[PDB]
Design a binder for this molecule. Structure first.
Ligand SMILES: *[C@@H]1O[C@H](CO)[C@@H](O[C@@H]2O[C@H](CO)[C@@H](O[C@H]3O[C@H](CO[C@@H]4O[C@H](CO)[C@@H](O)[C@H](O)[C@@H]4O)[C@@H](O)[C@@H](O[C@H]4O[C@H](CO)[C@@H](O)[C@H](O)[C@@H]4O)[C@@H]3O)[C@H](O)[C@H]2NC(C)=O)[C@H](O)[C@H]1NC(C)=O
Lengths: 390, 81
């Protein structure tokens, strides 16, 4: 329900901070996890790689897995008369076969013996599958950069898309400025094809795919009718003197789904193949800044909206609601020891602020181990919450 | 049936209703009678087959289910039911 909550709720969360000022900071991004970066006088940010997809990957080959036959035509000649022929033998849409068959007086020949026969039938694919080769060089990674403000709320994180060919990115964070970052991959395709059957896909070996006993068309083909190896889905029956039957095998979808048992299934959407990527990025924050210095410190009362929550990362989330007047105002907040002499711990949700009165704000803080005082606001009615961190 | 041509030779397009009847048609050489015994002769559809019915003078037919008595003719029919 608030900005930064998603990363707080993740079990795989790294906290990164640079040892220099104005220098680069390295982070590692994986699907399902997030990174929280922090720096002196700079807003805390959350980074998450949310998607890795191949766009318009090149089609290696199209395979026909279901076909129909029409236009069956047969031509045969008498013994000693040579090889018969049909024009259709030139038409790439037809599958043809030359054979020899017994001929004689009973079927128009003056001599008993074997004659040449040829039969053709128009081949029409009714269903095909595709083998694609994804170029690692062009995978597109989507990273979401969320200002860790604890702003309950319209306030969606900054989404950026990059490829390994992209140049340094300058992402703007509304109100904070811009953060610069560069990323590089870290793989799977020199050798695996991605077979797409209807709207599922599978990770398969190159040679296995190229050896499939099915009719095919090279990727470049847009015509899709001059199938190669049509005979793989066709059976020419034994010929008779003047005619011969040709039968097409049935759909091989089921045969494929079966041959695809154990193959790594690849998810996909809108025709694009999705993968789970791995990124290593460097980021610089010299162009970021805190939001709201123009504001002054709240001097109203806050009320802890709910039960203070403990996170999986040694921090706590305190949901407070401003009941005073004078907001947007800065939320007074400090963690100290039992005597309120020294300052202990630190905020993860840096520079907390109330945008609207009675719209509770969530604050993530890191109390020191043991006992401490969470001092929220300033008196009259200053909050003094006892906290024990185990 | 519809009488047409295939490379200059007569070509019959036979429909289901003609199963079992002698196919007659005049030709410059006289009246040609072709006999069609195709067991799989069905309705005209995309599943057609096309082949030649040879001229048989004085010989019993053998391994064929279509032949003519005066001029070799091509035949086409569908197999749909
Ligand atoms: C292959 O077969 C076809 C058809 O089977 C051949 O055409 C057919 O040839 C028949 C003769 O082989 C022909 O028969 C005729 O019968 C009548 C002629 O009279 C004959 O003459 C002798 C001599 O005196 C007599 O002894 C005796 O009376 C014979 O009958 C006659 O009435 C002709 O008739 C009509 O034909 C059609 C069909 O009924 C009528 O619609 C038309 O109005 C005519 O009046 C017939 O000419 C048989 O009818 C004929 N059928 C055809 C042409 O469709 C073909 O020539 C053969 N080809 C080869 C190379 O073998």
């Amino acid at each position: 329900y608030f900005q930064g909550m998603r990363c707080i709720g993740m079990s795989n969360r790294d906290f990164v901070e640079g040892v220099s000022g104005g220098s680069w900071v390295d982070i590692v991004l994986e699907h399902g996890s997030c990174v929280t970066t922090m720096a002196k006088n700079k807003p805390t940010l959350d980074f998450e790689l949310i998607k890795t997809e191949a766009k318009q990957p090149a089609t290696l080959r199209k395979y026909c897995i279901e076909a129909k036959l029409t236009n069956t035509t047969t031509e045969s000649r008498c013994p000693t008369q040579g090889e018969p022929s049909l024009n259709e033998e030139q038409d790439k849409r037809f599958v043809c076969k030359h054979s020899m068959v017994d001929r004689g007086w009973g079927n128009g020949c003056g001599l008993f013996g074997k004659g040449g026969i040829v039969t053709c039938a128009m081949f029409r694919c009714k269903k095909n599958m595709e083998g694609k080769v994804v170029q690692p060089e062009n995978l597109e990674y989507t990273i979401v950069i969320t200002p860790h403000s604890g702003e309950e709320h319209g306030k969606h994180g900054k989404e950026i898309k990059i490829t390994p060919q992209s140049s340094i990115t300058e992402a703007e964070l509304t109100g904070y400025g811009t953060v610069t970052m560069e990323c590089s991959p870290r793989g799977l395709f020199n050798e695996m094809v991605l077979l797409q059957m209807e709207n599922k896909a599978w990770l398969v070996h190159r040679q296995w795919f190229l050896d499939l006993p099915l009719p095919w068309l090279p990727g470049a083909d847009t015509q899709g009718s001059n199938w190669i190896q049509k005979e793989t889905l066709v059976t020419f029956k034994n010929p008779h003197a003047k005619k011969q039957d040709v039968v097409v095998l049935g759909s091989q979808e089921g045969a494929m789904h079966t041959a695809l048992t154990g193959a790594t299934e690849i998810q996909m959407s809108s025709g694009n193949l999705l993968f789970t990527g791995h990124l290593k990025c460097r980021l610089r924050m010299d162009k970021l800044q805190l939001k709201g210095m123009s504001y002054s410190m709240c001097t109203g009362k806050f009320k802890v909206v709910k039960e203070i929550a403990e996170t999986q990362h040694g921090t706590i989330v305190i949901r407070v609601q401003y009941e005073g007047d004078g907001s947007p105002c800065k939320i007074p907040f400090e963690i100290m020891d039992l005597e309120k002499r020294h300052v202990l711990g630190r905020l993860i949700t840096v520079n907390p602020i109330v945008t609207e009165k009675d719209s509770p704000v969530n604050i993530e803080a890191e109390p020191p181990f043991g006992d401490s005082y969470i001092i929220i606001g300033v008196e009259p009615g200053q909050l003094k919450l006892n906290w024990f961190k185990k | 049936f519809h009488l047409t041509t295939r490379n200059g030779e007569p070509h019959m397009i036979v429909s289901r209703q003609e199963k079992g009847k002698s196919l007659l048609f005049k030709t410059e050489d006289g009246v040609n009678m072709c006999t069609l015994m195709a067991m799989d002769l069905g309705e005209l559809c995309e599943d057609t087959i096309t082949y030649k019915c040879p001229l048989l003078r004085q010989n019993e037919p053998e391994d064929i289910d279509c032949w003519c008595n005066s001029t070799s003719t091509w035949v086409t029919y569908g197999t749909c039911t």
